[PDB]
Subunit: 174 residues, 2 copies
Amino acid sequence: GPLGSARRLYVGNIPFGITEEAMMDFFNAQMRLGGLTQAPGNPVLAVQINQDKNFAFLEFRSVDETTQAMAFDGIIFQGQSLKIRRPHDYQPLPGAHKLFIGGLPNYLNDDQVKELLTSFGPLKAFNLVKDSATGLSKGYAFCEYVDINVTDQAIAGLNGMQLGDKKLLVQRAS
Amino acid sequence: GPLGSARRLYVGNIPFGITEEAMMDFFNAQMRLGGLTQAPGNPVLAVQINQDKNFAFLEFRSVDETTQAMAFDGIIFQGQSLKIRRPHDYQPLPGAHKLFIGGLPNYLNDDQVKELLTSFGPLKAFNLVKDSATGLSKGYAFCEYVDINVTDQAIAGLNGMQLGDKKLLVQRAS
């Protein structure tokens, strides 16, 4: 990015020998049947297939329809479950999926707290709030995952859960 | 490779002395008469004749027109009723015998990985997946054998094989 790749999606596991036209027709028909289209006409403008590596890139007419179409992840097309993803180049804007982690033992250092979070996936940002004059923990931290799909996995696996004699709070910071 | 047999048909009970060009003219004429063509021009691209055993193969320009010509089973040519069938190696579900190969050492290149595979027989398709930014192997590959009946002999031979430091996964890609 920062503003790049907003109107394309990766589609993996496409059926063998399928055409660009046929894939286009399929996605345009689903957008309509599922009520995800936001104006009259076709949301998908073009499809590019790599037949050797069995994947496609769809290009959409709008930003919001690209986002809506991700709800089709897993849809079966000619026997095949399609893998729908953002382009590698796509990044959300900074602080969009920042997490607050509260209810931590205050005797734990930074690497020890990071350990629990990186079990779900890699981090692109982390800070453990400390009393700068003494250096000691305040019992809470902030972080952001490299993969934004992991955010809800960390919340689901850590929020409301027992850690020592204290219960964690894990939620979006804003 | 796989769809190659999706564009041909076996023809039996052919009349004595018939040429490849004569067979070609008859089938093109029949397809145009029935309106079974998808475009202008001639659907049959080539015919091969075995005159000793009285059969031919026809090759078509498309998968859909091949399926259509199947409706000519029993049609009369030079007083004789022709038998039209699929090749014995026709794949009705295409891509069914495509294999995934996982757990490869990441230093191995395309030719080294094929060498492991071609001990069981000739391949029709192969690709090793690489990171496009560095050109470095991601450690998995895909393939298909020319003879699909070798597929399960390769899975039996290769699946779970300790390959240096790693253990191979070899299965149908799905």
